[PDB]
């Protein structure tokens with residue numbers, strides 16, 4: 114069936130055909146919707162999946178059923194038959210990575226999807242190799258503040274006992290320390306990871322914003338610690354354009370958001386190590402990272418310096434402080450010429466991106482729960498935009514944390 | 522389908538277990554290959570006898586289970602009595618006790634409502650003896666006066682006769698009992714509430730003489746027994762309003778904004794045991810954001826962000842200054858302050874979302890679940906600093922329920 118989606122602000126109606134191509138389940142059924150749930154090979158499995166991907170690749174370059182296409186099918190078939198897997202061509206790898214981003218239903222930044230620098234690291238064999246590759250990624254992506262989207266792809270999974278993994282959840286994150294008095298210093302999101310680094314030999318500064326070491330696992334071996342050279346770690350001290358006292362809060366963040374714990378799937382092949390990076394939407398830092406109760410939780414401190422009456426919730430003192438923090442963050446990044454996008458501009462771009470995809474591609478899978486910003490929702494255009502969510506491959510998937518799997 | 526489904530709160534780590542979804546009745550619109558969770562809405566004929574029996578039995582069973590008389594003599598007798606009614610008259614009538622139970626539970630089952638901790642405290646007004654629009658007007662006026670209660674608002678529903686053949690429907694044509702007019706101007710601009718321009722035009726055609734102001738309370742347009750609808754003015758003394766002022770910004774009053782105290786939705790259909798109540802206005806009290814974010818700041822509504830921001834002397838040329846966000850917060854601060862000052866019941870979005878979490882938890886424990894639509898439950902501003910943002914929810918449709926129905930002017934056969 115052709116499915117329609119309406120924008121209730123502009124009354125624009127798009128028609129979705131693309132969803133007809135998905136073959137992977139979403140978690141919902143006819144009788145129960147799980148749209149707010151965060152997470153609901155063999156030779157015989159592998160070839161149909163490879164064939165599907167090869168087919169859409171040669172279809173994408175307008176040479177479906179070509180001599181080259183047919184040969185590739187045969188090439189891939191023989192290679193699965195004789196090795197229980199196959200290797201992607203470089204062109205395929207790049208096409209696959211861009212489309213995993215394209216298909217990422219939860220990403221509001223996908224207007225950029227085809228500007229992705231793809232680093233092929235499939236010849237890597239050791240944690241030291243991974244560290245070199247990651248350093249180059251970071252240096253290239255940071256670009257002195259003029260951030261550039263990139264992904265580095267390490268060797269595919271083989272038998273499951275020789276996985277490459279980046280144990281860090283992002284390449285750059287701050288440590289979190291569980292205090293004697295039961296509280297938390299630094300980032301409470303990373304307390305467990307920090308403890309593993311400590312246990313593995315990392316000597317913690319025990320400050321509020323200590324950059325974590327890289328913890329890297331190659332070919333299924335024990336992971337090894339590495340310090341990212343500090344000149345590669347671009348950071349922004351947070352200040353406020355009106356409140357002189359804001360800089361006295363001591364807040365800072367890092368410029369490069371680079372998620373490193375997801376799994377890239379292309380044509381049935383699994384890439385368990387594929388750190389990918391872009392640039393920040395301000396709310397990621399200013400709302401979630403700084404103001405989640407289970408994160409840096411700074412609302413009370415800021416509201417106090419703002420001298421706001423904090424006794425009753427209906428004074429909306431949290432909401433006032435939230436906006437000012439997010440102002441400061443955008444101002445700080447912009448003053449230091451570090452790429453950042455505000456949630457108005459970002460969501461705006463995403464609506465334009467949806468219109469592009471519906472025209473040229475017949476749809477765009479999108480997850481309203483994640484696309485709508487964590488503040489000021491309904492004064493952004495995506496709030497009023499009906500979206501259809503469905504799962505297309507290639508894709509980025511969640512995977513279990515390595516310390517639950519690995520035996521040393 | 523699995524017997525136990527789990528939901529997690531990502532802030533508190535609390536994990537709840539849902540068994541109530543097993544009692545789900547109609548489809549959600551999703552399939553296993555697509556999710557329609559952000560779609561707003563995923564023939565003139567009525568239920569046949571065969572369609573009607575199992576729906577009635579289902580409801581009667583559920584009623585007697587609730588009062589701990591399942592399998593009792595009374596239960597079996599009521600079953601038999603209902604069965605005979607349907608067989609000889611192709612429909613049946615609810616007992617008052619059943620009617621009150623069904624109405625309370627349609628609210629309890631309303632996945633999009635954040636206010637459901639209050640569900641058992643609902644004043645049900647039985648208007649199934651109503652025969653004319655004048656009578657509907659009498660019932661609606663009494664409802665408004667009772668629910669308003671001089672500002673100490675009390676939740677209530679008034680239930681007009683159920684549907685019979687579908688050519689004799691009772692309808693309130695208004696979408697809410699109390700709403701403001703909108704008037705499209707020859708030059709393309711709108712006066713009043715742009716959301717209501719269509720309904721307003723209908724009223725004007727029906728004879729209404731419009732004041733043509735910014736906040737003119739609309740007349741009731743009331744359809745009894747399938748007849749042409751009739752106009753009635755609500756006695757202005759029955760319409761509680763709050764002028765919007767600001768605890769710090771003295772100039773805020775000069776904006777001349779006000780809103781009405783009583784949110785009373787009147788265009789939904791109540792379904793109980795396969796019976797359809799097409800006219801069933803229900804009312805509660807407001808969450809601030811319903812007025813301060815949506816009513817006032819939606820672009821296709823009153824759209825006041827700009828004018829407020831200018832009076833705040835904000836720099837408005839760069840979106841990254843968050844002038845919209847800054848203005849939005851102050852507007853919502855004003856609304857809560859004005860209502861509280863005038864002692865009209867209102868709830869802020871922090872308090873409401875916290876109550877709903879406690880409510881949900883209690884429902885999971887005492888009922889085996891609580892259907893919730895995250896896309897509607899999370900407030901239109903400051904989402905993640907409310908506890909519902911981090912709460913996984915399962916959405917599914919239980920009966921009795923409130924349902925959408927077609928706009929009456931689109932279907933009505935004019936006499």
Ligand code: HEM
Pocket residue numbers: 214217219220221222223225229262263264389390391392393394397454459483509
């Ligand atoms: C270029 C600028 C980008 C911006 C502004 C952006 C923005 C965002 C935001 C705000 C989220 C929600 C994050 C959260 O709340 O945790 C997100 C999710 C996501 N992004 Fe993007 N993103 C960008 C680039 C990219 C790139 C380059 C990739 C991959 C090559 C990517 C893949 C993803 C994926 C897979 C998710 C969802 C992960 C999940 O399911 O948990 N994004 N993005």
Ligand code: HEM
Pocket residue numbers: 624627628631633634635636637639643676677678803804805806807808811868873897923
């Ligand atoms: C008592 C105080 C109440 C509060 C604070 C409250 C709050 C809300 C809010 C904020 C919404 C979202 C509205 C929107 O964005 O359009 C909503 C929706 C809804 N409420 Fe409640 N509500 C209350 C009482 C009631 C009552 C008494 C009923 C019925 C007996 C009810 C039934 C519903 C239904 C059916 C919806 C969703 C309508 C739809 O699907 O479009 N509510 N409520």
Ligand SMILES: CNCCc1cc(C#N)cc(OCc2ccc3c(C)cc(N)nc3c2)c1
Pocket residue numbers: 370371372374375389390391392393394397511512
């Ligand atoms: C409490 N937060 C946990 C939610 C989360 C989990 C995982 C994983 N695995 C991955 C996630 O990725 C979000 C993401 C991914 C990529 C991003 C890029 C490339 C840029 C950007 N600005 N934000 C991103 C944000 C998020």
Ligand SMILES: CNCCc1cc(C#N)cc(OCc2ccc3c(C)cc(N)nc3c2)c1
Pocket residue numbers: 784785786788789803804805806807808811925926
């Ligand atoms: C502008 N978009 C309108 C979306 C909407 C449509 C319908 C219908 N039909 C009914 C709706 O009801 C929302 C609602 C219903 C009852 C409420 C009560 C009883 C109290 C309250 N504070 N808000 C309500 C809000 C909303």
Ligand SMILES: C[C@H](O)[C@H](O)[C@H]1CNc2nc(N)[nH]c(=O)c2N1
Pocket residue numbers: 121496497498499500558559560561896897898
């Ligand atoms: C497209 C989207 O489903 C639509 O804008 C919804 C989103 N969530 C909402 N949530 C509430 N409470 N009220 C609404 O009117 C809407 N509108």
Ligand SMILES: C[C@H](O)[C@H](O)[C@H]1CNc2nc(N)[nH]c(=O)c2N1
Pocket residue numbers: 148149150151482483484531910911912913914
């Ligand atoms: C329970 C709920 O699904 C969860 O809190 C989600 C809601 N929406 C989100 N949206 C974004 N962008 N990021 C998130 O981490 C979340 N968390």
Ligand SMILES: [Zn+2]
Pocket residue numbers: 141145146147148551555556557558
């Ligand atoms: Zn769904």
